[PDB]
Write a protein that binds this ligand. Structure first.
Ligand SMILES: CN1CCN(C(=O)c2ccc(NC(=O)c3csc4c(=O)[nH]cnc34)c(-c3ccccc3)c2)CC1
Length: 296
């Protein structure tokens, strides 16, 4: 649809806000509007650039970053600016970190699944993101609205389905695995496979052998089932994104307050796992109370 060929002179480039999965992202102004501009640095990043330009111009969804246009002198994309930064920074960035609730955690994952389900429903071919992870998930509207970005492939071993790095043939089900890891990550406020570390191949080996993130103490059984289904070794046993959207949509009845902006401070550090399980960062006592009222 609407896509502007942009004269660079019209872009007032403010500060560098970070590096995307490729390129460099700057806060900028264009037509008196706040935008993000993504510029390639290397000549190698040109492939990711054409891919992203093609893919992002195809897509129109509330949970996918808006592409306003492109400049070719110099080669850069002009996109929606995400004032809340990345989910990864919200979760794991420098202190002070924001407080967030079970409702936020569930809402972010629902919104991610809605974006990805839209991708998987594209005609004539499904669009696969292939690099779903909190660095590539952005927040707007006081941290309450999530948008997928970094479509240059449409650092990442901790979210990658084992069939992807096994060089095996794969499908949209790879995004489902990634989503399952993200669900664990927002609930625990832990970096997946942080304890392994090393170089990437050590994570790949672990996941390849069936290592998954530790189970979560007092996690509601339906959330646990959904999570562990998503990270099945066999991609055909993983649910479709359409099913995840439906399940997560119905679960939100038991997670009111997702519309509350991130505004409260938090002082957060990690206790190690008591058994083989970890504590959730979020609290499920309210979920269980609301469930009990509804069911009996
Ligand atoms: C003081 N103020 C400074 C700016 N700010 C951020 O932290 C802050 C604000 C905005 C950001 N990005 C975007 O708006 C953005 C739009 S499209 C796109 C993409 O395709 N890839 C990565 N980022 C973006 C980032 C950021 C996040 C991850 C990687 C690179 C950039 C950080 C909030 C706090």
């Amino acid at each position: 649809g609407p896509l502007h060929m942009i004269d660079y002179k019209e872009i007032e480039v403010e500060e560098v806000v970070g590096r995307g999965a490729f390129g460099v992202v700057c806060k900028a102004k264009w037509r008196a509007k706040d935008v993000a501009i993504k510029q390639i640095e290397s000549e190698s990043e040109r492939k990711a650039f054409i891919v992203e330009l093609r893919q992002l111009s195809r897509v129109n969804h509330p949970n996918i970053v808006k592409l306003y246009g492109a400049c070719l002198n110099p080669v850069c994309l002009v996109m929606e600016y995400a004032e809340g930064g990345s989910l990864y920074n919200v979760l794991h960035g420098a202190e002070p970190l924001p407080y967030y609730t079970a409702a936020h955690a569930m809402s972010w994952c629902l919104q991610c699944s809605q974006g990805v389900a839209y991708l998987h429903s594209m005609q004539p071919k499904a669009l696969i993101h292939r690099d779903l992870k909190p660095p590539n998930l952005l927040l707007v509207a006081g941290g309450t609205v999530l948008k997928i970005c970094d479509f240059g492939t449409a650092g990442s071993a901790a979210w990658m389905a084992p069939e992807v790095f096994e060089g095996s043939n794969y499908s949209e089900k790879c995004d489902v695995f990634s989503w399952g890891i993200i669900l664990w990550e927002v609930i625990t406020r832990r970096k997946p496979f942080d304890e392994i570390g090393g170089p990437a191949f050590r994570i790949m080996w672990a996941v390849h052998n069936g290592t998954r993130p530790p189970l979560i103490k007092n996690l509601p059984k339906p959330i646990e089932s959904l999570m562990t289904r998503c990270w099945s070794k066999d991609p055909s046993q993983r649910p479709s994104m359409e099913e995840i959207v439906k399940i997560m949509t119905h679960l939100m009845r038991y997670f009111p307050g997702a519309d509350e902006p991130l505004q409260y401070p938090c002082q957060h550090s990690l206790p190690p796992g008591e058994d083989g399980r970890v504590e959730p960062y979020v609290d499920f006592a309210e979920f269980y109370r609301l469930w009990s009222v509804d069911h009996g």
